[PDB]
Amino acid sequence: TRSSRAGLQFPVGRVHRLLRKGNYAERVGAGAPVYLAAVLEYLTAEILELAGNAARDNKKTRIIPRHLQLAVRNDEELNKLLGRVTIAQGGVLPNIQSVLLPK
């Protein structure tokens, strides 16, 4: 196996397959799918880590879309990456503006 050869969980083979079939270029150098799989596993790790931490915060045995939305919107960088993304069953962050609250 190649992900073995690279220490990856994500399927280097299937990433190479998708890069080939996706017509992204005439040729896809063998280093490219390894690198992309690694990036796609550092991402995903990032967010699944934050979602599991949120699940601990929310005292849950399972990540539910709430936890993903919370993780994504609390992390300023993921919220930059995903600002034009919406997530099923995610809801929204607590947002009340100062003039709406009573003095």
Partner: protein, 78 residues
């Protein structure tokens, strides 16, 4: 049909949106804007459906329509 988007439903949404106080005129405005929105999204989705020669609009058609609109939705396949 359009009035099926009840006043309480719109209140609930605006509350999720953090709206404290609502002019009643907001309800028909919301209905109009939501109609326009749906119009555009469904038109794109059907246009994929038409191209696929399907009669069934699929979840993928909706996803791809939203991906066009800049509204990328996770939850139904990418």
């Amino acid at each position: 049909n359009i009035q099926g988007i009840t006043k309480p439903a719109i209140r609930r949404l605006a509350r999720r949106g953090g709206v404290k106080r609502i002019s009643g005129l907001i309800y028909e405005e919301t209905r109009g804007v939501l109609k326009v929105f749906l119009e555009n999204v469904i038109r794109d989705a059907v246009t994929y459906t038409e191209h696929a020669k399907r009669k069934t609009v699929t979840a993928m058609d909706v996803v791809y329509a939203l991906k066009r609109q800049g509204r990328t939705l996770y939850g139904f396949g990418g």
